[PDB]
Amino acid sequence: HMCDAFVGTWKLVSSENFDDYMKEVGVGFATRKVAGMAKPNMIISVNGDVITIKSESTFKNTEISFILGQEFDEVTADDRKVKSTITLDGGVLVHVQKWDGKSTTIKRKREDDKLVVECVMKGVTSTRVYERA
Numbered sequence: 328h329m330c331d332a333f334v335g336t337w338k339l340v341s342s343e344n345f346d347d348y349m350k351e352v353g354v355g356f357a358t359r360k361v362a363g364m365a366k367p368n369m370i371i372s373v374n375g376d377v378i379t380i381k382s383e384s385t386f387k388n389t390e391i392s393f394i395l396g397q398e399f400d401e402v403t404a405d406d407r408k409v410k411s412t413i414t415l416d417g418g419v420l421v422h423v424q425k426w427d428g429k430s431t432t433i434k435r436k437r438e439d440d441k442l443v444v445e446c447v448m449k450g451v452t453s454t455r456v457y458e459r460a
Contacts, residue, residue, distance in 0.1 A: 329395070329415060330373050332437045337369045337457035340441075348446050348453035352431060354405045362386050362404060369442070369457055378413070 342363075349359045367384035379392045387404040393413050401411040401424065409424040420435040434445045444455040 330371070330378055330420070333371045333420070333435065333442065334373055335371060336460040337371070337442050338460045339366045339369075339455055340458050341454075341456045343454045344451065345446075345453040345455065348448055348451050349405070351448035351451040352405070352407075353429075358405050368460060 346359055346363055349362065354362070365384040365386040367382045367386075370379075370381040370383065372379045376394050377392055378395070379390065381390045382388065382404065384404075389402075389404050391399070391401055391411070393399050393411070395414055396412065398410055398412045401409050403409060403424070407424070407426050409426040411422060411424050413420055413422045415421070418436065422433040422435070424431050424433070431446065431448045434447075436443050436445075440458060442457040444457065446453045446455070
């Protein structure tokens with residue numbers, strides 16, 4: 328029942344500072360422009376200890392399945408090959424991505440009827456807000 332309140336289909340309703348976050352991550356111009364247009368759906372499900380997060384978007388479709396605390400390989404929407412670890416900290420999913428000596432952290436939390444995604448790269452944050460589809 329660890330992630331019950333995350334389970335479902337969520338649609339992006341707002342984004343702030345995503346372009347600057349992507350710049351800080353190292354995403355190139357064309358990918359930033361096309362990725363920034365997208366209004367993805369995020370589909371979260373749980374089966375036993377395995378959590379699956381899918382992103383359905385006009386830019387890129389992605390899927391990760393993972394066990395909390397157990398590192399896995401991930402190919403991000405912007406095509407980075409990263410090593411990811413996701414934990415639960417005080418009811419927040421905390422996702423750390425490592426690649427090329429770099430690191431970024433994505434936090435996912437429930438707040439009222441929304442799922443709020445905070446992406447942090449050094450000093451730069453982007454906030455993406457989703458509502459139930």
